[PDB]
């Protein structure tokens, strides 16, 4: 044997065999991170008596850092803030960690309504770090250095081919797989096909709708003005013309048809503006599509920024009038049209992250959670069936309110008017949240109601023209299966409309949600059918809908050029300027290169999806419900038969597994080359 002392001497005395620079950081050692935040004064300061003095120790943020180090630092500080929220929510009795018996009367005192003066729709009143009265956003701004190393970054470029090459080289390996890649895996990520497909199977699949006759007539007139006879004939024919309408952004912000969307970002030295500014731009875009009989959604027209009418706007029409159409200009080299698609993507980033995700799943659900906790006692069937879908939701939403919206979304959006905003009330991101919350319709977003209102005959169509809409096909199935389970459970106790109407809690529950919760579209439940649909909607909102709009966040956003949050240059002044656009015009509009603080925009655009990500599923739920109701004797509860709950859970489990097979078929049944849709695989939701 060569003895241990010789193996030790040989390792210490020889040159290094392993170069640490060739081994990128994947995880922060949590203890080293906490020490470094403290060393850099990115920490709460205290008086001698051990209380917080409301300040941070540091006057200014980090001088210097790396892309990878900052990205990981942002995830780490967010996950720390989420841990702090859980701890505070435990301390305050909002979400106890160890189970505690609380009479309803105690819960009415614990769970209060916020008053709206924080700029948010009504949520849990939050009264350690959560003990003060928006400085937590200053701590995050300090983690983003003044400047970073631009070498071997995803934004460096300086060309699109350069960022594409870098993007591909970062993929691991040789549903699980899809998560750790992005749409840039496709060389034709920019294509009409993959652009339009996102409106059916991307992170925002539930807002595309049938174009009204009024809208089609606007686009008929605009095509007449541009002398485009072919596209005018397609619209006049009017065969399955669809719209993604983002024109409401102006109504939502109180912006006039003369005002442009601009975010003027002020560089800060601590709290003090340096005078250096960065401008980002948004657009209330409109996309017109045609759904072909073969199932392929084709984009026909994009209005960059809809300003009251098409007469007062810039509308470009696709050179290609069907999916297979050709012309002497390749899709890759059609820069005016690629610019238009990129603008429409910025619009969908806003609608997705603010409305479809934050409002429609988190803030709507929080009102219902608070209302439920205040009105329905913990012993009740209604509480037992809803509450498991709400585990640690209130604490995560508190973290999101303090950091995500003001610190990230308000920064990379192009609505402004300024970042940081001195007040919430001038800030267009907050107005968009307010408007989206006020204009959410709880019953219209019941899956069967939603699909019909948006003009999709998913129920009965046998043409196969919805084969590229797996969100809709999967959701029709999944809703029906969740409703079946809710039906079996609810009817165990609620044997007639009379039992609903005489219920001590349901009446007050609906009123609490409608008034204090400010969801007047929540039903006044007087029937078993209404009770089933409301409960189905709550479970849908909490689990599969949230999964659908969140699971592939990283896939669709992390390669920023495919779906940027905002434009880095002004819109073209008129249609003439747009038609002259080249590769350089689209590149300048994207956060590519080492100028104009664009590294920060790329970092935060790629980071947001990560912050919203990193057995929380219906199968685990079903097995768990089955298990406790196998263990229950029949005497225990008298309002419902727990053997029926056991039966419902067994049924639900099997129905979910069966549906999982169909979700696969609907994904594989898409037209050749279409991106996979594995987001609802039952042990995913």
Least CB distance to its own copies at residue 450 (A) = 14
Kindly state the tokens that stand for 402. Answer: 């303090």
Cβ distance to Fe ion smaller for residue 393 or 681: 393
Preceding peptide of 315 cis, ω within 30°: no
Of the candidates 460, 573, 634, 638, which one interacts with its own copies according to CB under 8 A? 460
Q: What is the C-alpha separation between 480 and 28, in angstroms, rounded?
A: 44
Binding partner of 395, given Fe ion, its own copies, none, CB within 5-8 angstroms per partner class: none
Q: Which residues contact 402 (CB under 8 A, 6 or more apart)?
A: 81, 134, 136, 137
Closest residue by Cα to residue 354 from 201, 248, 242: 248
Instruction: Find which of Fe ion, its own copies, none residue 630 binds, CB within 5 to 8 Å per kind.
Output: its own copies
679 binds its own copies (CB under 8 A): no
Q: Does 97 bind its own copies (CB under 8 A)?
A: yes
Q: What's the longest Cα–Cα distance across the chain?
A: 90
Q: With binding defined as CB under 8 A, does residue 62 bind its own copies?
A: yes
Q: Is 435 in the site for its own copies (CB under 8 A)?
A: no
Size of the site for its own copies (CB under 8 A): 115
> Is there a binding annotation on residue 540?
no
Backbone angles phi, psi at 199, to 5 degrees: -75, -15
**Site residues (CB under 8 A) for its own copies, limited to 362-421:** 378-379, 384, 387-391
Distance (Å) of CA 21 to CA 18, 24, 25, 27, 517: 9, 7, 9, 15, 52
Binding of its own copies at residue 631 (CB under 8 A)? yes
Q: Is residue 672 close enough to count as binding its own copies by CB under 8 A? A: no
Using a 10 angstrom Cβ sphere, with 0-12 exposed, 13-18 middle and 19 or more buried, the burial of residue 198 is: buried
**Distance, C-alpha 293 to centroid of its chain:** 31
Q: Measured from the CB atom, is 207 or 543 closer to its own copies?
A: 543
Which of 103, 127, 251, 333 is the binder for its own copies (CB under 8 A)? 103
502 binds its own copies (CB under 8 A): no
For the bound state, the minimum distance from the C-beta of residue 395 to its own copies, rounded and expressed in Å, comes to 11
By a kind-dependent CB cut-off of 5 to 8 A, residue 62 interacts, out of Fe ion, its own copies, none, with its own copies
The partner in contact with residue 100, picked from its own copies, Fe ion, none with C-beta cut-offs of 5 to 8 angstroms by kind, is: its own copies
CA torsion, ordered 373, 379, 380, 384, to nearest 10 deg: 70
Residues 11-30 that bind its own copies (CB under 8 A): 11-12, 16-20, 23, 25-30
The two structure tokens encoding residue 270 = 């601590």
Q: Are 393 and 369 in contact (CB under 8 A)?
A: yes
Distance of alpha carbon 190 from alpha carbon 195, whole angstroms: 7
Q: Which residue in 482, 492, 489 sits closest to 617, CA to CA? A: 482
620 scored as a contact of its own copies (CB under 8 A) = yes
Only one of the segments 239-247, 251-259, 435-443, 463-471 lies at the binding site for its own copies (rule: CB under 8 A); that segment is: 463-471
- Closest by CA to 461, choosing from 240, 199, 197, is 240
CB 9 to its own copies: min, Å: 8
DSSP 3-state assignment of 308? coil
Q: Whole-number minimum distance, CB 546 to its own copies, in Å? A: 15
Query: Which of these segments, 190-198, 310-318, 513-521, 658-666, binds its own copies (CB under 8 A)?
Result: 658-666
Cβ atoms < 10 Å from Cβ of 332: 13
Measured from the CB atom, is 350 or 477 closer to its own copies?
Answer: 477
At 683, list the tokens: 């042990």
Rounded CA separation 252/415 (Å): 11
Regarding 350 and contact with its own copies (CB under 8 A), the answer is: no
- Rounded Cα distance between 34 and 329, Å, is 55
80 binds, among Fe ion, its own copies, none (CB under 5 to 8 A by kind): its own copies
Is residue 135 helix, strand or coil? coil
Helical (H) or strand (E) element with 435 = helix 428-438
Phi, psi of 324 (to 5 degrees): -95, -10
Q: What 8-state DSSP symbol labels residue 567?
A: B
Q: Which does 172 bind (CB under 5 to 8 A by kind): Fe ion, its own copies, none?
A: none
Neighbouring residues of 389: CB distance < 8 A, sequence distance ≥ 6? 538, 539, 542, 543, 621
292 is in an annotated binding site: no
Rounded to whole angstroms, the Cα distance separating 592 from 550 reads 25
Q: How far is the CB of 613 from Fe ion (least distance, A)?
A: 9
CB of 128 to its own copies, least distance (A): 6
User: Which of the choices Fe ion, its own copies, none does residue 36 contact, using the CB cut-off of 5 to 8 A by kind?
Assistant: its own copies
Residue 300 belongs to what H/E stretch? strand 297-303
Q: Which does 39 bind (CB under 5 to 8 A by kind): its own copies, Fe ion, none?
A: its own copies
Among 622, 648, 675, 680, binds its own copies (CB under 8 A): 622
- Which position among 60, 112, 129, 220 is part of the footprint of its own copies (CB under 8 A)? 129
Does the protein bind its own copies through residue 36 (CB under 8 A)?
yes
Q: Which residue number, 514 or 685, has a Cβ lying nearer to Fe ion?
A: 685
Given the rule CB under 5 A, which of 323-331, 426-434, 547-555, 588-596 is the region that contacts Fe ion? 547-555
Taking the least distance from each CB to Fe ion, the nearer of 297 and 548 is 548
Compute the least distance from the CB of residue 106 to its own copies, in Å. 5
Pairing of strands 286-291, 272-281: unpaired
Q: How many residues does the chain have?
A: 685
Taking CB under 8 A as the rule, does residue 294 contact its own copies? no
How many beta carbons lie within 10 A of that of residue 366, not counting itself? 25
362 is in an annotated binding site: yes
User: Using CB under 8 A, which residues numbered 571 to 610 contact its own copies?
Assistant: none
Q: Any binding-site annotation on 47?
A: no
Question: What distance lies between CA 676 and its chain's CA centroid?
Answer: 19
- Closest-by-Cβ residue to Fe ion is 550
Q: Which residue has the tokens 């009102």?
A: 367
Binding of its own copies at residue 80 (CB under 8 A)?
yes
| Under rule CB under 8 A, residue 65 binds its own copies | yes
Distance (Å, whole) CA 127 – CA 398: 11
| Candidates 162-170, 187-195, 423-431, 544-552; binding stretch for Fe ion (CB under 5 A) | 544-552
SS (H, E, C) 520-566: CCCCCCCCHHHHHHHHHHHHHHHHHHHHHHHCCHHHHHCCHHHCCCC
Residue 127 lies near its own copies (rule: CB under 8 A)? no
Residue 227 touches which of Fe ion, its own copies, none (Cβ within 5-8 Å per kind):
none
From residue 137 to residue 166, the character string flagging contacts with its own copies as x (rule: CB under 8 A) and all else as - is --------x---------------------
Which residue in 256, 258, 615, 672 binds its own copies (CB under 8 A)? 615
Minimum CB separation from its own copies for residue 503, in Å? 19
Q: Under DSSP, is residue 257 helix (H, G, I), strand (E, B) or coil? A: coil
72 vs 302, which CB is nearer to its own copies? 72
Q: Where does residue 125 rank: exposed (0-12), middle (13-18), buried (19+ CB within 10 A)?
A: middle
- Whole-number Å distance between alpha carbons of 352 and 555: 14
Q: Site for its own copies (CB under 8 A): which residue of 34, 260, 321, 499?
A: 34
Per CB under 8 A, the segment of 9-17, 255-263, 405-413, 509-517 that binds its own copies is: 9-17
Q: What is the dihedral of CA 510, 513, 519, 520, to 10 degrees?
A: 40
Of the pair 339, 652, the CB lying nearest its own copies is at 652
Residues lying near Fe ion in the complex (CB under 5 A) are found at 550
Known binding-site positions: 357, 362, 546, 550
Known binding-site positions for Fe(2+): 357, 362, 546, 550
């Amino acid at each position: 044997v060569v003895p241990p002392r010789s193996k030790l001497d040989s390792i210490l005395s020889s040159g290094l065999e392993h170069n640490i620079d060739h081994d990128p950081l994947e995880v922060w050692d949590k203890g080293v991170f906490l020490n470094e935040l403290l060393k850099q004064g990115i920490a709460l300061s205290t008086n001698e008596n051990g209380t917080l003095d409301g300040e941070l120790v540091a006057d200014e943020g980090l001088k210097k850092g790396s892309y990878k180090g900052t990205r990981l630092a942002l995830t780490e500080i967010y996950s720390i803030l989420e841990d702090a929220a859980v701890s505070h929510f435990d301390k305050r009795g909002y979400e106890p960690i160890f189970p505690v018996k609380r009479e309803l009367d105690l819960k009415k005192r614990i769970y209060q309504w916020s008053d709206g003066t924080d700029g948010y729709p009504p949520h849990l009143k939050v009264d350690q770090i959560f003990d003060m009265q928006s400085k937590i956003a200053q701590a995050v701004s300090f983690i983003i250095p003044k400047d970073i190393d631009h070498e071997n970054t995803p934004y460096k470029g300086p060309t699109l081919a350069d960022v594409e090459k870098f993007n591909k080289a970062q993929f691991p390996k040789t549903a699980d797989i899809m998560k750790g890649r992005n749409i840039g895996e496709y060389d034709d990520w920019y294509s009409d096909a993959r652009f339009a497909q996102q409106h059916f199977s991307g992170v925002n699949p539930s807002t595309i709708e049938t174009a009204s006759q009024d809208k089609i007539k606007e686009y008929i007139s605009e095509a007449q003005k541009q002398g485009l006879d072919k596209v005018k004939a397609i619209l006049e024919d009017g065969k399955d013309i669809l719209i993604q309408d983002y024109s409401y952004f102006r109504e939502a912000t109180g912006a006039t048809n003369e005002q442009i969307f601009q975010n003027t970002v002020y560089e800060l030295k601590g709290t003090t503006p340096t005078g250096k500014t960065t401008s980002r731009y948004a657009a209330a875009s409109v996309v017109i599509f045609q759904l072909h009989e073969d199932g392929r959604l084709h984009p026909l027209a994009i209005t960059l920024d809809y300003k009251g009418s098409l007469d007062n706007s810039i509308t470009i029409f696709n050179r290609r009038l069907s999916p297979d159409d050709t012309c002497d200009i390749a899709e890759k080299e059609d820069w005016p049209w690629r610019y238009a698609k990129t603008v429409a993507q910025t619009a969908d980033w806003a609608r997705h992250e603010v409305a479809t995700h934050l409002v429609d799943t988190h803030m709507i659900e929080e009102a219902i959670i608070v209302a439920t906790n205040r009105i329905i006692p913990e012993g009740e069937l209604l509480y037992e069936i809803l509450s498991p879908h709400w585990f640690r939701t209130l604490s995560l939403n508190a973290a999101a309110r303090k950091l995500l919206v003001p610190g990230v979304i308000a920064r990379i959006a192009g609505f402004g008017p300024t970042s940081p905003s001195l007040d919430f009330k001038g800030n267009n991101a907050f107005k968009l949240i307010d408007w989206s919350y006020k204009n959410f319709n709880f019953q219209d977003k019941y899956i069967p109601n939603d699909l019909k209102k948006r003009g999709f005959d998913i129920k009965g169509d046998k043409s196969g023209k919805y084969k590229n809409y797996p969100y809709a096909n999967d959701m029709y199935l999944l809703w029906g299966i969740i409703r079946n389970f809710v039906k079996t459970v609810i009817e165990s106790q609620y044997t007639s409309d009379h039992v609903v109407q005489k219920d001590p809690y349901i009446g007050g529950w609906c009123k609490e949600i409608q008034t204090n919760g400010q969801i007047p579209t929540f039903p006044t439940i007087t029937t078993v059918e209404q009770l089933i649909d409301a409960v189905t909607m709550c479970i849908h909102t909490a689990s599969p809908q949230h999964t659908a709009v969140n699971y592939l966040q990283d896939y669709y956003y992390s390669f920023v050029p495919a779906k940027p949050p905002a434009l880095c240059t002004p819109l073209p002044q008129d249609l003439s300027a747009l038609q002259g656009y080249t590769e350089k015009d689209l590149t300048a509009a994207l956060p590519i290169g080492t100028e104009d603080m664009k590294w920060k925009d790329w970092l935060l655009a790629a980071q947001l999806p990560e912050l919203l990500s990193y057995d929380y599923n219906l199968i685990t739920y079903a097995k768990s419900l089955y298990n406790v109701n196998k263990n229950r004797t029949i005497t225990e509860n008298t309002k419902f038969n727990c053997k029926t709950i056991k039966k419902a859970a067994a049924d639900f489990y099997s129905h979910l597994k069966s549906a999982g097979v169909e979700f696969e078929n609907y994904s594989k049944g898409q037209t050749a080359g279409t991106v996979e849709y594995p987001v609802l695989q039952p042990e995913t939701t």
